[PDB]
Paper text:
Interestingly, the active site His117 in azurin renders the copper atom solvent inaccessible, reminiscent to the likely role of Met147 in OprC. The superficial similarity of the OprC binding site to that of (pseudo)azurin prompted us to generate the M147H and M325H OprC mutants in an attempt to convert OprC into a unique, blue copper transport protein. However, in the presence of added Cu(II), both mutants remain colourless, and comparison of the crystal structures with those of pseudoazurin and plastocyanin show small but most likely important differences in the geometries of the active sites.
Here, we show that Pseudomonas aeruginosa OprC is an outer membrane, TonB-dependent transporter that is conserved in many Proteobacteria and which mediates acquisition of both reduced and oxidised ionic copper via an unprecedented CxxxM-HxM metal binding site. As indicated by the successful structure solution, OprC contains a single bound copper and shows the typical fold of a TBDT, with a large 22-stranded β-barrel occluded by an N-terminal approximately 15 kDa plug domain that, like in other TBDTs, completely occludes the lumen of the barrel. The copper binding site comprises residues Cys143 and Met147 in the plug domain and His323 and Met325 in the barrel wall. The CxxxM-HxM configuration, which coordinates the copper in a tetrahedral manner, is highly unusual and has, to our knowledge, not been observed before in copper homeostasis proteins.
Numbering used by the authors: 66 to 445, 449 to 723
Amino acid sequence: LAPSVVTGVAQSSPLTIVTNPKEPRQPVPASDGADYLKTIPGFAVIRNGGSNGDPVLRGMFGSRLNILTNGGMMLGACPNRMDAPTSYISPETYDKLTVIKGPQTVLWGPGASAGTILFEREPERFGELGSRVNASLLAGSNGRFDKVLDAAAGNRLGYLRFTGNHAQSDDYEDGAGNTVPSRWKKWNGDVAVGWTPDEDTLIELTAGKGDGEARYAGRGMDGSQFKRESLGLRFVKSNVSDVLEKVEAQVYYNYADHIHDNFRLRTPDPSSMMPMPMASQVDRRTLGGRLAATWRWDDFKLVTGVDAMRNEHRARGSKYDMMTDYYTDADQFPWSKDAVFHNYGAFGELTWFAAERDRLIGGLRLDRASVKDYRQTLKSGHAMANPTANDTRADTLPSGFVRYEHDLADSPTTLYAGLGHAERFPDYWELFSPKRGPNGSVNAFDKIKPEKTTQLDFGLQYNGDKLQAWASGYVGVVQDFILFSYREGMMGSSTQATNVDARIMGGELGASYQLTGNWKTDASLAYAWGKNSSDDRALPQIPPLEARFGLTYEEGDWSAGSLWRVVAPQNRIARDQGNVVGKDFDKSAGFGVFSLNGAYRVTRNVKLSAGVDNLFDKDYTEHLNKAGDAGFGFSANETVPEPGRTFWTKVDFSF
Ligand SMILES: [Cu+]
């Protein structure tokens, strides 16, 4: 029961990873959800600056990941994804993090072709009047300071919960001694009110808000505001009849209000195409809901239900009267709506427990998706007509999967193989952000097709006594993979969205071995591969082969760890192609990074941990990081470097 620092998370059951995000993590995360995914093999992160990275799973970017918080969807507003869904999540304020790899669930929404990520808080369990406090403080290099408070009180009949955090860092340094533009601040406060009139009934109301700022080495602008407001209502009814085990009902409202500019966290670049102050303000308003029934009987479990979603995007921008040298801020103009999305779906998942060592799971959903272009004009001696103003388009998209899981007779082994098909309607960035659509189209909104993935997943679990191992591989094809291509034109850079066909394959594996009662070791490996077979070319933005080796010594109340991370070169690139955020340009160099950690339980209630990240102060960058901005002194296509040696200390309280 000795405390330790988390450097990797294993796969605990076929395709699924479950972890407590309150444990200290050894490459210390920045209070965002992308960094908490770095310890799960198969995840990589596009670095923008000090925080708010964009998560990449098995080489898949963006909405191919379905990222939920308490069952709801929080979508960002930045047309350049400065505020990806994970940038609104502070994972320490949650209780559980679940990842399901591959298109192997239908219960949580449309289009999760790459995987599903679920951040959860679990309702209190008070049986008598009482209270609960969890908290933590973290301090480290470069002004890093974090506070987290999670308190609740209640009784058999109901409860009140408050969770909040405040977190910040100054600019960090790379391993060559340069200050990287990358300071950030984040804070959140949320309340939950729970009513439990009896054991079979839970009704819970939630409301919360947060804000932040972030300096972006890899952008022409910084994020000076990331406002979030959230409202939720969920209802669980248990043991309704002998076969109706559970009924779930949930609605959520999430509002993002984002500002980026070139003068609040930097000064305007004199040699850029924005030498004058400029700010843009955008928001995203999201309303959605879910209703699901769970039936159990004989050797069968059936989960059935429907879900719905609507979201809306608006924007307004500042103006700079050159002649009088006068600046009118963006909040002096009306909001201007530009897009509305809708989705309605019906879904079901049946499970058969054949005998005791055999499981068969099948799932299906049908989705009705639609979008409307509300842009009355476009940008380009200022504006131009939008040829699809007020147009609508829609599609209906079936998805499903089958999965077989067999447990061996002799060893504690599970084998599994699964077939999944997933169809995803294009998202805001794929339709509204490209400057051009496919050749011969009027724009991207009018022509980009839905993306259709067919994938075979397979793997094994070995749950031995000294040895714990797992592996998970996948082969698939993507029809109408949505791809970005980049051109110069001496107008800045400009993008084109196209549909192409693709092959993908890869996998993750890992093991941990209890050497002695004190000594444990573990390792992991992750590989992704992709081909643009429409163009006989590699897919862009695929992270290279990556390995982790850990060693831990634990002894009563304390433990000590060492971690090695070793990353291969990525020589498979597609220059000037990528997504809405990034593009390939050069092959990447391989590297190794080394870290140490320790932990110590002082009392039942107080536990301590500390680490040194990147002990040897290695100067390195990752394949997927953004190119640095010229106005900060970055040449060429020099990508943002990773941090050099950093120290941190954490104390966890629990009462
Ligand atoms: Cu932005």
